[PDB]
Design a protein around this ligand. Structure first.
Ligand SMILES: [Fe+3]
Ligand code: NA
Length: 183
């Protein structure tokens, strides 16, 4: 059997135009190229979260990844939130969301941006996402808090949006009334 392994050098950095492009919708049934890319994206996240592996493979921990970060302008994202959501989503799409807002108190990370960016990124506390798995099955799941934030951060990627685009540079920690900060 064979497969490629994502290395930190395969992950493009802020400044690369591919990160600003609206990714392309993928065709169904899924090609094997697309199925393999997903398995590759998911193996990465899991490996980056395992001390021994992450260290030997020199990987920076992550909980979500989008194809554009690998310089592949396709609507594919993977998430491995440490308990529990672990899956690859093809052509993900948010159908609805809560009024209630939330944000990560420690701020959002991004394997593609090396600089530190102060501020809070306000997002929807709850969302309903529809997507296709590697088997072609369609899904509709309700997510919230950390997982909702992760998926929102990843889908932004397939639409060419970076997390700091949501941060008011002059009022970085601006928060409306009632925002839930997770941390
Ligand atoms: Fe990111
Ligand atoms: Na690759």
């Amino acid at each position: 059997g064979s497969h490629m392994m994502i290395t930190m050098d395969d992950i493009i950095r802020e400044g690369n135009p591919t990160l600003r492009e609206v990714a392309k919708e993928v065709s169904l049934p899924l090609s094997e190229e697309d199925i393999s890319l997903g398995k590759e994206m998911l193996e990465f996240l899991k490996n980056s979260q395992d001390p021994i592996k992450a260290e030997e493979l020199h990987l920076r921990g992550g909980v979500g990844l989008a194809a554009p970060q690998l310089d592949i302008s396709k609507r594919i994202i993977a998430v491995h939130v440490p308990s529990s959501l672990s899956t690859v989503m093809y052509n993900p799409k948010i159908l609805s969301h809560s009024v209630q807002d939330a944000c990560l108190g420690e701020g959002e990370g991004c394997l593609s941006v090396d600089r530190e960016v102060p501020g809070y990124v306000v997002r929807h506390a709850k969302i309903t996402v529809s997507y296709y798995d590697m088997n072609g099955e369609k899904h509709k799941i309700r997510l919230k808090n950390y997982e909702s934030i992760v998926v929102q951060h990843e889908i932004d990627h397939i639409n060419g949006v970076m997390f700091y685009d949501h941060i008011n540079d002059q009022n970085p920690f601006a928060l409306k009334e009632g925002v839930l900060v997770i941390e």
